[PDB]
Design a protein around this ligand. Structure first.
Ligand code: MG
Ligand code: NA
Ligand code: NA
Length: 229
């Protein structure tokens, strides 16, 4: 059957340095085993280049919250998102210097998104930075996402739920995630086995404490298949 797994905060912990989130041997073994028994999909806001190096396994992925997928190794742009490739290049070029204007600010460039991390930044200039980002968004016609210590410019209309729905249709599936974008995905796929990771109110059918418990559940599902055959 199908299994859709969010990456950050679901399979790995949320950390201050997101560029370091490579999968450890434990996760590599778990997913390696899991993909042998289930059609496995990593669903993330990360790019295919990121997940590909973080988790170098033979699995499918829905990236950028659905703007691009990597299926059977093929980079597949969805909803004509490739029309935005030149846009994000320009956005990065015109805003990369902000790292000096706002010491502490970190900018993560991706083909279809530019993520501004305010984690190490001073509090005082955040409202100013936020307004600058929104201005760039209006200028280039892109969409702005506000997360925890994060502000990301992305392709308008991306939606994890819709992307997942599009793949599974009505087929049975497991869907796991840790934040609002996943909560929304559960809503768009409420007939699936929804799993919430972390604290907070949720409508998921099952709930786990953290990525460690999440991994344990996946570990168990694997053992179930070993007996099942
Ligand atoms: Mg997450
Ligand atoms: Na992470
Ligand atoms: Na976690």
């Amino acid at each position: 059957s199908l299994i859709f797994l969010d990456y950050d905060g679901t399979l790995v912990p949320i950390i201050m340095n997101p560029e370091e989130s490579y999968a450890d041997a434990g996760l590599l073994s778990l997913i390696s085993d899991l993909k042998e028994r289930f059609d496995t999909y990593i669903v993330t806001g990360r790019s295919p280049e990121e997940i590909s190096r973080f988790l170098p396994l033979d699995i499918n992925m829905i990236c950028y919250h659905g703007a691009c997928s990597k299926i059977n190794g093929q980079i597949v742009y969805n909803n004509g998102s490739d029309r935005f490739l030149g846009v994000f290049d320009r956005i990065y070029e015109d805003t990369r210097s902000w790292v000096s204007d706002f010491p502490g600010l970190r900018i993560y460039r991706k083909n279809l998104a530019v993520l501004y991390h305010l984690g190490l930044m001073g509090a005082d200039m955040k409202p100013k930075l936020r307004s600058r980002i929104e201005e760039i968004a209006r200028i280039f016609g892109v969409e702005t996402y506000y997360g925890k210590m994060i502000i990301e410019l992305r392709v308008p209309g991306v939606n994890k739920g819709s992307a997942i729905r599009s793949v599974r249709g009505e087929r049975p599936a497991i869907i796991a995630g840790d934040d609002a974008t996943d909560e929304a995905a559960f809503e768009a796929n409420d007939d699936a086995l929804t799993i919430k990771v972390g604290e907070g109110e949720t409508h998921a059918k099952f709930h786990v404490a953290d990525y460690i418990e999440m991994r344990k559940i996946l570990k168990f599902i694997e053992m179930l298949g070993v007996q099942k055959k």
